[PDB]
Amino acid sequence: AKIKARDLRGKKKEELLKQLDDLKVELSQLRVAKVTGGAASKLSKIRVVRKSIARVLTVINQTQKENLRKFYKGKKYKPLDLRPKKTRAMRRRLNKHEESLKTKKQQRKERLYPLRKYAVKA
Amino acid sequence: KIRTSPTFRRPKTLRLRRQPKYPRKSAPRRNKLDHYAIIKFPLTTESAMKKIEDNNTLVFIVDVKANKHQIKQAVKKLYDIDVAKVNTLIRPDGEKKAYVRLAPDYDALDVANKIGII
Amino acid sequence: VKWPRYIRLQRQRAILYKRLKVPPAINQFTQVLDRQTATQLLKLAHKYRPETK
Amino acid sequence: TKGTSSFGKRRNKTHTLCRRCGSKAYHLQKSTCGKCGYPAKRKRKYNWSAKAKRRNTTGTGRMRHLKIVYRRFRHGFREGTTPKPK
Amino acid sequence: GAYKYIQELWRKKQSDVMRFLLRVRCWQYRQLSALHRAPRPTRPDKARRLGYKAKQGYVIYRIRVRRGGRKRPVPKGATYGKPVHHGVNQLKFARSLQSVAEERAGRHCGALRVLNSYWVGEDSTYKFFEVILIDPFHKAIRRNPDTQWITKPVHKHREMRGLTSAGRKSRGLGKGHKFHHTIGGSRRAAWRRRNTLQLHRYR
Amino acid sequence: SSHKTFRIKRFLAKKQKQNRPIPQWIWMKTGNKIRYNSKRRHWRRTKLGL
Amino acid sequence: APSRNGMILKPHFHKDWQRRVATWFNQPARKIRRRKARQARARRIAPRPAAGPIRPIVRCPTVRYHTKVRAGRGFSLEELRVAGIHKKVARTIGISVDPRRRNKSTESLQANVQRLKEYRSKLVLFPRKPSAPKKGDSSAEELKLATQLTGPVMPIRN
RNA sequence: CGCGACCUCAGAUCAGACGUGGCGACCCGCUGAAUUUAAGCAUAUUAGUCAGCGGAGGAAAAGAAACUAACCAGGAUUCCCUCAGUAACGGCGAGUGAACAGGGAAGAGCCCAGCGCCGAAUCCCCGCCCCGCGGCGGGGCGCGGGAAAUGUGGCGUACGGAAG
Ligand SMILES: [Mg+2]
Ligand SMILES: [Mg+2]
Ligand SMILES: [Mg+2]
Ligand SMILES: [Mg+2]
Ligand SMILES: [Mg+2]
Ligand SMILES: [Mg+2]
Ligand SMILES: [Mg+2]
Ligand SMILES: [Mg+2]
Ligand SMILES: [Mg+2]
Ligand SMILES: [Mg+2]
Ligand SMILES: [Mg+2]
Ligand SMILES: [Mg+2]
Ligand SMILES: [Mg+2]
Ligand SMILES: [Mg+2]
Ligand SMILES: [Mg+2]
Ligand SMILES: [Mg+2]
Ligand SMILES: [Mg+2]
Ligand SMILES: [Mg+2]
Ligand SMILES: [Mg+2]
Ligand SMILES: [Mg+2]
Ligand SMILES: [Mg+2]
Ligand SMILES: [Mg+2]
Ligand SMILES: [Mg+2]
Ligand SMILES: [Mg+2]
Ligand SMILES: [Mg+2]
Ligand SMILES: [Zn+2]
């Protein structure tokens, strides 16, 4: 019936591939019914099974790539799919540590001579 | 030592194998051209039905990245029937029509009544 | 043999240092300390080497 | 025979489709495109034709990546979060 | 320290010690190719006072610009125009050969950024410049605060906007009454403030 | 030219599929301003480029 | 083709000037931009003077103008070392410094010295952490009545 | 002959990174005409403009005097009013044409090399453990590998500075 993507996430891998194989079989039979000339019910139904294929493949690819990134969570060189894909200059930007670290000259200047909190009487 | 030939050649050095510290892309690409997406549907034209009736072939259309080998592997996995030969052409619409001549112990009229085209 | 260009230039640079009139300020470095005094100085100098990390 | 009877011999073509601009301007003998200059790394573009600039700039095609980068900029390139579920 | 001694040595150039040195260096550099990596500076004091701190990430190239003026790249004679603009032979180019040197070295290395550049030798037909490059994605550069300024995107390709010493000396700027025709950002910014009408709202 | 190449034959396949007329269920729509396929192409009149 | 009588004139329009004409239609938008920025700056430095630091008594250079006294760039080092304010502490508590100024006179130096000592008698400097004052901080009563002053701090009139 | 240090110089589908190309209204570098004006035209004018080429950023460039002045002296850059259609250039013809000073917008200053003195006191990279990890960073451990004395880091820069 109405397959949906909250009923697919705890589902294990091989029965998801079995569900995918059955939906592929059903799409192929409906295409043969289309070219033979079948019912308007079946010609309706091929959109339902294409989107069924679609959300099963969505659930498979999501649960694959989530496991990939919590496999590569703690590691230092993680693949390029799993790295942050923001814009090119924003990846080539200096990071939050190297823009923060100051030399000993200006940090002793910031120690000795800080900005004060003054107010001038009229 | 001694040199015999008067040409200096490049000394053949050592080249290590790729030992990559992390894979480039994480998941391998899923096979988008597989046994269901390789054949789309069979034809039901009068020429196609006369050919499956007489010459014991089937007339499919496939997508154009197929091989004759991929088409016969696909039909052998999808309908469990052995395939003698495959003749492909590209129609003027642009799909790749394929002609799947079966092994002579199978009969394509029975296969067509099995898979719906009649 | 037809040597590579870097081997040709690094030999004939030494040939040019033999050909040209080297000024004495550069000539003074090839008038060098001989071996039976140099090994004396180095076995003395090996005692006062700076520390390994 | 400067005109009508010399227009009959026109049967072997000079240009064909390029692979970067898609227009039929890829010369065969020079093997360089006329509108984009195919073996050159840089797009053939001149300022003496603002109309030939306006025919294909950033606003023309699909902008498959760049309309997406606009709608990602309007929230500031969030990643890794999903909205909290129901 | 030694660098005062060797900078006085490099200031004495007609002394025959230095004449022998830069003649043999100029021979070697003429033999070697047009654009090759020098492994360490020939002139370490001038490298250090231009910015080369000898750590990991600074490289030095030794490039050969071909010496001369600039004849006008026009077919055979024939500058089609008025007789002020006929002459092609005795024209001179606006940027120094040091700037052309650092320009084509920073072009050949797109990943690296030109810090400064200095002189090593000359003959009649070439001049030789050693140009200092910084690898801006190396972390000995990036974690050093007083030189992580080179790792910003505004300092992309300094040699071609003309922001180094050699490019800076050809834009005609600096304080003074000698440089009235560049006040504003540059020469063209001077021209552009001067040749616009400021049509106000109330006139 | 019965010695076509693949790119040329594919290009002709696309234009042959585009040359079919309008489907007649459209001009009963609501926001419709279409009366016939204006972009059609007869093989004597327009020679397609190429 | 000049007519009978009238000034012969040289209008500088022989260039192509219509591609470059700066028109001032964003004059009031630019003024409201600047004053909204000025209000934001003046409320983000909250008790400090909105006009910035204090700037010294300075006589104008040339023969046309030397009888008028205007506000200068910064206090020079010599009147700073006479007033006892440290070089690097002056601009951190609000006294503008340029080292490039000389002092060829004496009475202008002493006018700037008296002006600095007047400023140090007038300012109210808050303790850095409010829970623990130090010896160089003002009293908590005048801390309560500290506020900004608008316009240039101690306006300079001849 | 061999073995070993270094110096130059190659080779890698070596480990990790990086540049390429696009848009180009505003910005920066170079190149750069001629119609036009001079009632002709050649210098000039158009014009350091159109075209061309390279390169960026959210602004760019500039910038903390080898300055302006000649006064009772001002004091980084940039932008506006004004200086001024003035001084000045120009077949002194047509035409071109700044700057200082003053009033405003804004306001912020700094850092190396050298001179030196500190037992290279400095930096990069691998491995293991703990923490955080969609800006790969903090701490410890390494008889772990390199860089660097052909000079890294600390103090220190013309407003002087260091040591006692
Ligand atoms: Mg320092
Ligand atoms: Mg031809
Ligand atoms: Mg281009
Ligand atoms: Mg002329
Ligand atoms: Mg700058
Ligand atoms: Mg000069
Ligand atoms: Mg015809
Ligand atoms: Mg009249
Ligand atoms: Mg590799
Ligand atoms: Mg680019
Ligand atoms: Mg004329
Ligand atoms: Mg006329
Ligand atoms: Mg004429
Ligand atoms: Mg001109
Ligand atoms: Mg002019
Ligand atoms: Mg242009
Ligand atoms: Mg950008
Ligand atoms: Mg800037
Ligand atoms: Mg200075
Ligand atoms: Mg000024
Ligand atoms: Mg007037
Ligand atoms: Mg005359
Ligand atoms: Mg002024
Ligand atoms: Mg104000
Ligand atoms: Mg030092
Ligand atoms: Zn093309």
Amino acid E110 CA to nucleotide H20 C1' distance, rounded Å: 8
Task: Measure Cα distances from G10 to E195, E200, G5, G7, G69 in Å.
Answer: 15, 22, 16, 10, 39
Q: β-pairing, D24-27 with E58-66?
A: unpaired
Tokens standing for residue G113? 């010295």
Q: Which residues of E touch G23 (CB under 8 A)?
A: 199
Buried (b) or exposed (e) across B41-60, using 16+ Cβ within 10 A? bbbbeeebbebbeeebbbbb
Resolution value, angstrom units = 3.6
Q: Evaluate whether chains B and D are touching (3 or more beta carbon pairs less than 8 Å apart).
A: no
Q: State the Cα–Cα distance between residues A62 and G103, nearest whole angstrom.
A: 75
Half-sphere exposure of A120 (CA within 13 A, CB side): 23
DSSP symbols for G59-87: E-SSTTTTTSEEE-S-B-HHHHHHHT--H
Q: Which residue has the tokens 């000539």?
A: C27
Q: Name the residue of chain B whose CA is nearest to C3's CA.
A: B8
The dihedral region occupied by E82, where left means phi > 0, alpha psi between -120 and 50, and beta the remainder, is beta
Contact D71, D77 (CB under 8 A): no
Helix (H, G, I), strand (E, B) or coil at B25: coil
Query: Is E91 part of the contact surface with chain C (CB cutoff 8 Å)?
Result: no
Give the DSSP letter string of chain A: ----TTSSSSS-HHHHHHHHHHHHHHHHHHHHHHHH---HHHHHHHHHHHHHHHHHHHHHHHHHHHHHHHHSSS-SS--TTTS----HHHHSS--TTTTT---HHHHHHHHHS----EEE--
Which is it for strands B57-62 and B96-102: parallel, antiparallel or unpaired? Answer: antiparallel
Strands E58-66 and E126-134, sheet pairing: antiparallel
Q: Which residue is nearest to nucleotide H124 (CA to C1')?
A: E140
CB pair distance less than 8 Å for C2 and B8: yes
**Using CA atoms, how far apart are residues F23 and F42, in angstroms rounded to an integer?**
18
Give how far Cα B6 sits from Cα of B2, B9, B13, B17, E17, Å: 11, 9, 21, 33, 39
Q: Å from A109 to nearest chain E CA?
A: 15
Q: Which residue is closest, via its CA, to the C1' of H111?
A: E146
Of B69, B57, B35, nearest to B102 by C-alpha is B57
For residues E1 and B48, give the distance between their C-alpha atoms in angstroms, rounded to a whole number: 96
The span from the CA of G138 to the CA of G143, in Å, is 7
Distance CA G71, CA G155 (A): 9
Residues of chain F in contact with residue D24, where contact means CB-CB under 8 angstroms, are 49-50
Length reported for chain E: 203
The amino acid that residue G1 corresponds to is A
Q: Which of E174, E160, E161 is nearest to E109 (CA)?
A: E160
Burial of D15 (0-12, 13-18, 19+ CB in 10 A): middle
Q: Which of G23, G26, G30, G31 to mutate to test the interface with E (most CBs of E within 10 A)?
A: G23
Query: A11-38 burial string, b = 16+ CB within 10 Å, else e?
Result: eeeeebeebbeebbebbbbbbbbebeeb
Chain G residues touching residue E200 (CB < 8 angstroms): 24, 27
Q: Which helix (H) or strand (E) holds E116?
A: strand E113-122
- Identity (one letter) of the amino acid at B90? I
The tokens for E177 are 């009454």
Total residues found in chain F within this entry: 50
Neighbouring C-beta atoms of residue E57, cutoff 10 Å: 19
Q: Which of E48, E63, E170, E35 is nearest to E119 (CA)?
A: E63
> In a 3-state reduction of DSSP, which class is residue B2?
coil
Whether residue E115 contacts residue E50, with contact meaning beta carbons closer than 8 Å, is answered with yes
DSSP-assigned letters across all residues of E32-59: S-SEEEESS-SSHHHHHHHT--SSTTEE
| Structural element, H or E, at residue E8 | helix E2-11
Residues 6+ apart with CB under 8 A from E35: E61, E63, E64, E104, E105, E108
In this structure, the strands spanning D24-27 and E126-134 are: unpaired
Continuous segment of H or E residues that includes residue E198:
strand E197-199
CA distance F3 to F14: 18
Which whole-number Å values give the CA distances from G147 to A122, F28, G47, G55, G119, in the listed order?
Answer: 9, 75, 5, 20, 15
Is the Cβ of E55 closer than 8 Å to some Cβ of chain A? no
Calculate the angstrom distance between C1' of H84 and CA of E183.
Answer: 18
CA atoms within 13 A on the CB side of D16: 11
CA-based nearest distance F28→chain D, Å: 30
Which backbone phi and psi does D10 adopt, to 5 degrees?
-75, 90
Q: Report the chain A residue with the minimal C-alpha distance to residue D70.
A: A87
**Rounded CA–C1' distance between E82 and H85, in angstroms:** 30
Question: What is the experimental method?
Answer: cryo-EM
**Nearest CA to the C1' of H41 belongs to which residue?**
E82
Non-local (6+) Cβ contacts of B66 within 8 A are: B33, B38, B88, B96, B98
The span from the CA of G140 to the CA of G145, in Å, is 9
In terms of Cα–Cα distance, which of A76, A74, A80, A61 is closest to A17?
Answer: A61
Q: Identify the chains in contact with E, defined as 3+ C-beta pairs within 8 A.
A: A, C, G
Closest ligand by atom to D47 CA? 16
Distance of alpha carbon E105 from its chain centroid, rounded?
A: 10
Nearest Cα to E38, choosing from E29, E49, E46, E27?
E29
Give the separation between CA D36 and CA D53, rounded to whole angstroms. Answer: 11
Of E63, E43, E62, E163, nearest to E115 by C-alpha is E163
Within 13 A of G76's CA, how many CA atoms are on the CB side?
18
D52 at interface of A, judged by CB pairs closer than 8 A: no
On whether D18 is known to bind a ligand per the annotation, the reply is yes
Assigned token pair, D21: 């601009």
Q: Beta partners for B59?
A: B99
Residue pair A14/A63 in contact (Cβ under 8 Å)? The answer is: no
What residue of B is the nearest CA neighbor of F6? B90
Orientation of helix E16-31 relative to helix C5-19, angle to 10°? 160
* Chain position carrying tokens 């504003």: E184
Q: Please, is G49 exposed, middle or buried when counting C-beta atoms within 10 Å of its C-beta (0-12, 13-18, 19+)?
A: buried
Tokens, residue G17: 């000037």
The C-alpha atoms of residue B84 and residue B102 are separated, in whole angstroms, by 5
Chain H nucleotides reached by a protein CB under 7 Å = 1-2, 7-25, 27-35, 42-63, 65-82, 85, 95-116, 119-121, 123-125, 132-138, 146-156, 159-160
What dihedral do alpha carbons E172, E173, E174, E176 form, nearest 10°? 80
Taking the CA of residue E131 and the C1' sugar atom of nucleotide H30, their distance in angstroms comes to 20
Beta-carbon separation of A103 and E146 below 8 A: yes
Q: Which amino acid is at B83?
A: V
Tokens of C23: 């000024």
Q: Which residue has the tokens 């007869």?
A: F42
| Structural tokens at position A92 | 């080539």
**CA-closest candidate to residue E132, choices E50, E28, E9:** E50
Burial class of G46 by CB neighbour count within 10 A (0 to 12, 13 to 18, 19+): exposed
Please, which residues have CB within 8 angstroms of residue E199's CB and are 6 or more apart in sequence? G21, G22, G23, G24
Q: Which residues in chain B (5-44) have CB-CB distances under 8 A to chain C?
A: 5-8
Give the Cα separation of E35 and E12 in Å (integer): 28
Nearest CA-CA partner of B34 in B78, B79, B1, B4: B78
From the CA of G116 to the C1' of H81: give the distance in Å. Answer: 33
A112 CA from centroid of ligand 1 (Å): 17
CB contact set of A87 (below 8 Å; sequence gap of 6+): D69, D77
Q: What is the DSSP secondary structure assignment for residue B88, as one 8-state letter?
A: E
- What six digits make up the tokens of E31? 């033999």
Distance CA E112, CA E156 (A): 9
Backbone angles phi, psi at A120, to 5 degrees: -100, 125
Would you give the distance in Å from CA G58 to the centre of its chain? 12
E176 CA → ligand 20 middle, Å = 10
Say if residue D33 carries a ligand binding annotation: yes
**Is the Cβ–Cβ distance between G39 and G31 less than 8 Å?**
no
The backbone torsions φ and ψ at residue E127, rounded to the nearest 5 degrees and listed phi first, read -130, 155
Of residues B75, B79, B56, the one with CA closest to residue B66: B75
The first and second tokens of residue B66, run together, are: 């197929």
d(CA G76, CA G157): 20
Would you state the structure tokens that stand for residue E72, as one six-digit string?
């006008």
Residue C24 has which token pair? Answer: 């004495």
State the angle between helix axes of B108-115 and B46-54 in degrees (0 to 180), rounded to the nearest 10: 130
Distance CA E191, CA E183 (A): 9
DSSP G95: B
